[PDB]
Design a protein around this ligand. Structure first.
Ligand code: AMP
Ligand code: AMP
Lengths: 176, 176
């Protein structure tokens, strides 16, 4: 129901052609839809604290997730909520109690100001690779859609060298 | 219920500092919230055709809007819809019939593939300026907040020159 973890993320923007080629190299054919419902204050408090708050709806699950700065990478706090809980946070200015609330209070985020600001859809596939999780995302934003490759690892040094070598292996330039 | 118009609108991205200064400059105090709910096919058909399809929720009003290329700026087709019509489009992905649908069919969009992809909150202020309308936008996207100045004009040539001139006076670089 609730988990925390420290995660380090690398990300690279790729063309469709690069994306398809990399998918083919890893036998990625099926993608899973997810929708991210994001929150912020009118003053952008969370962005100011290098942090992000969202409810992810993926298959049957809603997960309230906070990402904040760690000494390196991010401290993630995840809390599975009900559909009714998720709807309530989107409709009204209440955040459910529990671990995410507790972290937001330590961050000194004016919790009552948090408002549901928007949403976006991602078609996602993951594979385990080297020190971590290689993620293939195709996301649909307001104006445009992107292809992205992410790599989530627990060891920064080796994770970074591994991601960079994978990109060079496939002739994909670094685009941050 | 239904209108069309050719809209000629220049846009420039600005920083938060530039934005606040420009607002003070123009005595812009009160902003109006809107939420845009955007639609696209998995193959990005709208975007490939220079177009966009969105339901705008502002105050108590919902407007289905298609923007498409014209010889100058964009041709917009707006259709006022009820809240329930709005929600059924979002939950079922079926676009209601009428002028937007008619235009979509002429563009040759595979309309049955259109899906609800996401939403975005924009805060907007306006003021009349040199025979045009100056628009101040602050939008809250998935992990950033974006500031824009826009200028809606009647004539492309002179509107351009007056927008570029405004930007120059406030030492705002051109950023499209
Ligand atoms: N602002 C909102 N208010 C109420 N319900 C919503 C809102 N956004 C999404 N939903 C609903 O909550 C569920 C999650 O939406 P989604 O993640 O967009 O599929 C769906 O059944 C939607 O119909
Ligand atoms: N994905 C969705 N599915 C069903 N209903 C929604 C969805 N998104 C928004 N709504 C509803 O439509 C109305 C407009 O939402 P908003 O424009 O997000 O304020 C609200 O009363 C919501 O409960």
């Amino acid at each position: 129901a609730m988990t925390q973890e420290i995660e380090i993320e690398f990300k690279n923007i790729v063309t469709e052609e690069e994306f398809h080629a990399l998918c083919k190299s890893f036998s990625i054919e099926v993608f899973t839809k997810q929708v991210n419902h994001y929150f912020e204050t009118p003053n952008s408090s969370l962005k100011e604290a290098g942090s992000a708050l969202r409810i992810r709806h993926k298959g049957e699950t809603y997960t309230l997730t906070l990402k904040q700065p760690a000494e390196v990478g991010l401290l993630e706090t995840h809390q599975v909520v009900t559909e009714n809980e998720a709807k309530m946070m989107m409709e009204t200015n209440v955040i459910i109690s529990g671990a995410v609330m507790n972290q937001l209070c330590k961050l000194q985020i004016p919790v009552s100001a948090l408002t549901y600001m928007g949403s976006l859809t991602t078609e996602r596939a993951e594979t385990l690779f080297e020190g971590g999780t290689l993620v293939f995302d195709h996301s649909f934003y307001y104006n445009h859609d992107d292809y992205e490759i992410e790599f989530e690892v627990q060891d920064e040094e080796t994770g970074k060298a591994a991601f960079i070598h994978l990109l060079k292996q496939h002739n994909i330039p670094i685009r941050h």
